[PDB]
């Protein structure tokens, strides 16, 4: 539910930092996608 429940270890801290960088990178890549789509979408509407 609120957490992934990997068992507490320095391995799991590394894996969760990696998962955080993964998810934050995914957010940034998809934010660029959303911005580029939004620009074209508003251009097309005016056309």
């Amino acid at each position: 539910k609120d957490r992934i429940e990997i068992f507490p270890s320095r391995m799991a801290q590394t894996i969760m930092k990696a998962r955080l960088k993964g998810a934050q990178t995914g957010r940034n890549l998809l934010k660029k996608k959303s911005d580029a789509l939004t620009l074209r979408f508003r251009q097309i509407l005016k056309k």
Binding site: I4, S9, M16, L20, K31, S34, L45, K47
Partner: protein
């Protein structure tokens, strides 16, 4: 062509924004709350270790003091 493009872009924006907000409000919060639990319980194991090592060190000092007293 503008109509089909516009309608397709609207759906693609909704799909993309659902993923962006699911990352921002589900995936990242599960990970950050997990990482807080991992850092917390990792520190709990570090305290439980510290306490055992400290109590061992005190018993050793008692045994050394007793061993010197036994010379009298």
């Amino acid at each position: 062509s503008l109509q089909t493009s516009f309608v397709t872009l609207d759906e693609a924006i909704k799909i993309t924004n659902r993923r962006v907000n699911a990352i921002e409000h589900v995936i990242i919060p599960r990970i950050e709350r997990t990482l807080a639990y991992i850092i917390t319980e990792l520190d709990e194991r570090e305290r439980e270790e510290f306490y055992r090592l400290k109590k061992i060190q005190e018993k050793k000092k008692i045994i050394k003091e007793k061993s010197e007293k036994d010379l009298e």
